[PDB]
Design an enzyme around this catalytic site. Sequence first.
Site, PDB file in Angstrom:
ATOM      1  N   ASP A  73     208.332 118.629  68.455  1.00 34.36           N
ATOM      2  CA  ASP A  73     207.482 117.895  67.513  1.00 34.36           C
ATOM      3  C   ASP A  73     208.235 117.482  66.244  1.00 34.36           C
ATOM      4  O   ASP A  73     207.754 117.660  65.116  1.00 34.36           O
ATOM      5  CB  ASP A  73     206.211 118.680  67.187  1.00 34.36           C
ATOM      6  CG  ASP A  73     205.229 118.662  68.342  1.00 34.36           C
ATOM      7  OD1 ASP A  73     205.609 118.150  69.426  1.00 34.36           O
ATOM      8  OD2 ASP A  73     204.081 119.131  68.170  1.00 34.36           O
ATOM      9  N   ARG A  95     205.318 127.549  64.950  1.00 31.73           N
ATOM     10  CA  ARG A  95     204.382 126.874  65.839  1.00 31.73           C
ATOM     11  C   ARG A  95     205.037 125.721  66.614  1.00 31.73           C
ATOM     12  O   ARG A  95     204.536 125.343  67.679  1.00 31.73           O
ATOM     13  CB  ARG A  95     203.182 126.357  65.025  1.00 31.73           C
ATOM     14  CG  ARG A  95     203.553 125.296  63.979  1.00 31.73           C
ATOM     15  CD  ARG A  95     202.405 124.717  63.157  1.00 31.73           C
ATOM     16  NE  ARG A  95     202.949 123.785  62.150  1.00 31.73           N
ATOM     17  CZ  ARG A  95     203.155 124.064  60.847  1.00 31.73           C
ATOM     18  NH1 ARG A  95     202.787 125.232  60.315  1.00 31.73           N
ATOM     19  NH2 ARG A  95     203.677 123.140  60.045  1.00 31.73           N
ATOM     20  N   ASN A  96     206.162 125.180  66.117  1.00 31.04           N
ATOM     21  CA  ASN A  96     206.858 124.038  66.697  1.00 31.04           C
ATOM     22  C   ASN A  96     208.124 124.456  67.413  1.00 31.04           C
ATOM     23  O   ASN A  96     209.011 123.635  67.649  1.00 31.04           O
ATOM     24  CB  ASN A  96     207.194 123.018  65.609  1.00 31.04           C
ATOM     25  CG  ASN A  96     205.971 122.251  65.141  1.00 31.04           C
ATOM     26  OD1 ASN A  96     205.054 121.985  65.924  1.00 31.04           O
ATOM     27  ND2 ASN A  96     205.926 121.936  63.850  1.00 31.04           N
TER      28      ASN A  96
HETATM   29  C1  LIG Z   1     201.342 127.111  68.831  1.00 33.08           C
HETATM   30  C2  LIG Z   1     200.816 126.126  69.527  1.00 33.08           C
HETATM   31  C3  LIG Z   1     201.149 125.899  71.037  1.00 33.08           C
HETATM   32  O1  LIG Z   1     202.131 125.216  71.236  1.00 33.08           O
HETATM   33  N1  LIG Z   1     200.455 126.436  72.186  1.00 33.08           N
HETATM   34  C4  LIG Z   1     200.698 126.261  73.653  1.00 33.08           C
HETATM   35  C5  LIG Z   1     201.713 125.418  74.199  1.00 33.08           C
HETATM   36  C6  LIG Z   1     202.011 125.188  75.560  1.00 33.08           C
HETATM   37  N2  LIG Z   1     203.087 124.275  76.006  1.00 33.08           N
HETATM   38  C7  LIG Z   1     203.547 123.095  75.389  1.00 33.08           C
HETATM   39  N3  LIG Z   1     204.427 122.321  76.129  1.00 33.08           N
HETATM   40  C8  LIG Z   1     204.849 121.195  75.549  1.00 33.08           C
HETATM   41  C9  LIG Z   1     204.464 120.731  74.300  1.00 33.08           C
HETATM   42  C10 LIG Z   1     203.542 121.542  73.593  1.00 33.08           C
HETATM   43  C11 LIG Z   1     203.047 121.157  72.267  1.00 33.08           C
HETATM   44  C12 LIG Z   1     203.698 120.307  71.396  1.00 33.08           C
HETATM   45  N4  LIG Z   1     202.914 120.152  70.215  1.00 33.08           N
HETATM   46  C13 LIG Z   1     201.729 120.930  70.338  1.00 33.08           C
HETATM   47  C14 LIG Z   1     200.635 121.124  69.450  1.00 33.08           C
HETATM   48  C15 LIG Z   1     199.598 121.937  69.815  1.00 33.08           C
HETATM   49  C16 LIG Z   1     199.638 122.576  71.075  1.00 33.08           C
HETATM   50  C17 LIG Z   1     200.704 122.380  71.923  1.00 33.08           C
HETATM   51  C18 LIG Z   1     201.798 121.553  71.603  1.00 33.08           C
HETATM   52  N5  LIG Z   1     203.096 122.708  74.136  1.00 33.08           N
HETATM   53  C19 LIG Z   1     201.186 125.917  76.500  1.00 33.08           C
HETATM   54  O2  LIG Z   1     201.408 125.771  77.881  1.00 33.08           O
HETATM   55  C20 LIG Z   1     200.515 126.387  78.807  1.00 33.08           C
HETATM   56  C21 LIG Z   1     200.179 126.780  75.974  1.00 33.08           C
HETATM   57  C22 LIG Z   1     199.897 126.978  74.590  1.00 33.08           C
HETATM   58  N6  LIG Z   1     198.878 127.869  74.225  1.00 33.08           N
HETATM   59  C23 LIG Z   1     197.508 127.348  74.197  1.00 33.08           C
HETATM   60  C24 LIG Z   1     199.081 129.302  73.835  1.00 33.08           C
HETATM   61  C25 LIG Z   1     197.728 130.082  73.568  1.00 33.08           C
HETATM   62  N7  LIG Z   1     197.440 131.262  74.554  1.00 33.08           N
HETATM   63  C26 LIG Z   1     198.750 131.883  75.067  1.00 33.08           C
HETATM   64  C27 LIG Z   1     196.496 132.274  74.026  1.00 33.08           C
END
Ligand SMILES: */C=C\C(=O)Nc1cc(Nc2nccc(-c3c[nH]c4ccccc34)n2)c(OC)cc1N(C)CCN(C)C
Lengths: 285, 292
Positions: free
Chosen positions: B156, B142-143
């Site tokens: 993270d 996840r990270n």
């Molecule tokens: C697994 C969780 C996740 O990271 N989901 C996610 C992430 C990003 N981009 C992004 N960019 C920089 C930092 C982070 C980040 C750092 N710590 C966290 C904790 C929780 C969430 C995110 C975090 N993330 C996305 O960019 C668009 C999208 C995304 N998602 C919501 C994927 C879910 N979809 C594809 C169904």
Amino acid sequence: NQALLRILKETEFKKIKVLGSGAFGTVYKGLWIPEGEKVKIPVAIKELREATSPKANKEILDEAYVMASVDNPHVCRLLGICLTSTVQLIMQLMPFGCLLDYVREHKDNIGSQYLLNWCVQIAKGMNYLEDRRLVHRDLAARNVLVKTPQHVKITDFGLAKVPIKWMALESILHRIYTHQSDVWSYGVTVWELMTFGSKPYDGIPASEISSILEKGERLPQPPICTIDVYMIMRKCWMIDADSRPKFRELIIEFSKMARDPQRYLVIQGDSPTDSNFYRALMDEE
Amino acid sequence: NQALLRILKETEFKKIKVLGSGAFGTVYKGLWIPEGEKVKIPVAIKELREATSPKANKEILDEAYVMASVDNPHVCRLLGICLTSTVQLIMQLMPFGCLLDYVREHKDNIGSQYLLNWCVQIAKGMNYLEDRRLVHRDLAARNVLVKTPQHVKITDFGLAKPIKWMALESILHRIYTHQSDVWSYGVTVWELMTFGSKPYDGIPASEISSILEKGERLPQPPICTIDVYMIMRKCWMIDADSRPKFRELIIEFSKMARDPQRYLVIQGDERMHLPSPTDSNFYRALMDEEDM
Ligand SMILES: */C=C\C(=O)Nc1cc(Nc2nccc(-c3c[nH]c4ccccc34)n2)c(OC)cc1N(C)CCN(C)C
Ligand SMILES: */C=C\C(=O)Nc1cc(Nc2nccc(-c3c[nH]c4ccccc34)n2)c(OC)cc1N(C)CCN(C)C
């Protein structure tokens, strides 16, 4: 070589908003959707004005491989092409736009360090194009794109399918295009930056520019330009093409000026943090 | 040093959409709006859940300068910070999301070359952190963020101030070292090769140290040859000094990545494949211009 030009389908990108137009067609901000992925990647799309023929496409596509081969920090590279009724060219989107609009919008709070460095970079990009034996033919401040305020790139060179006030006299009279006529346009381009985007020869129709040039008139000295900078511009507009400076020389002279910018531009009012910040978010090359 | 962390004003960035939540707070997709300009640049923004004092902020700043100093293709760098009632941290937005979500959603199109190459890259980023003497403490699928499908970056870390990913000595004695990161690396690799399955699914966290002491480990993933599982098992040795080093994991997964179908047996592996040089150049020019 051939790995530099990606062939795209209609179905994997969409135009969303019009950005501009050139003599070749309209420029759009678009979105690229990788097949089988869920993201949408911003791109710029150049739609050619005319519905093109297979002989033109073969000339366009093979010339697109050359445009996709330019490898220089201050020259925009073509990334992909899509051949619909009209040909669509895909390149990197520059959210800051062209230097012409940028310098107009920051009309008197740009310092000499930025102005002189832009001149160095454009000269660096043109010299590369010359090294590749490529004539731009339409160098102008509208054809320098801003990647970051600290990093500009030349675009929209190529294709033989008019900007009178930027053209060397021999281009107006005889349609001779050489690297030395690009130097004339570079000189006009530098003047645009130094006047913060003033229109060259304002008050003179295009049809009469060659008459005033033959009579020896040139663009006037910009208020902020010392005579050191103006002499370089005037040397770019010599009638004898071979007496004009070469782009490699323009790199050196303007690099020298960039080391003591307040000596060479009299602008009223003259960190790694923000450069590193810009580079991380917009400019990793 | 202090030039790698930009101090931002409230008025120059906006949260626009919630992306997810973590232990230290909520992460948003946002927009950075440089003063005096007209552009809006997508970023990720992490708002801290708990509201800190000025003296807490001084220590947070001290580590934010360290977090802003990480310079590696496979480790996410902190880019900026804004000191509100709840502190906001600004970093690069990864449009592809985290690798755990990616591997679950694309599991039927992920070939061996991608999985093995992700393992190489995560070990590279962890080896860099180790070279910087920075213990991650929370490595998990996840990270690990996907900048592109071909390029992932660890995120993270740098929190200090997840039982089923932790080394036994971390559960029992709160000892965190680079070698406990290696154990977490082993679990992360297991997450990828099982396409995002939950480790020890159905076992309460409070009972995990018991099964580890009795010698139970995560099972061999169906697609893994024994070569890959032996590495995972060596990551979960009780003797921390016996676990592999990240330096060795770069090498071993690199060797496997040169012959990926010898080491992962995926149904359909032949009808999937990595991008041609054309597709890699196109990806990098649009989204990923860094060295790597
Ligand atoms: C697994 C969780 C996740 O990271 N989901 C996610 C992430 C990003 N981009 C992004 N960019 C920089 C930092 C982070 C980040 C750092 N710590 C966290 C904790 C929780 C969430 C995110 C975090 N993330 C996305 O960019 C668009 C999208 C995304 N998602 C919501 C994927 C879910 N979809 C594809 C169904
Ligand atoms: C001076 C005109 C201009 O370039 N304006 C502009 C440009 C971009 N970005 C961009 N990115 C890649 C290629 C090009 C490009 C290449 N050839 C041309 C020819 C004409 C225009 C653009 C060209 N441009 C923008 O990105 C968002 C915007 C922009 N403007 C100022 C749009 C108008 N505003 C009022 C919304």
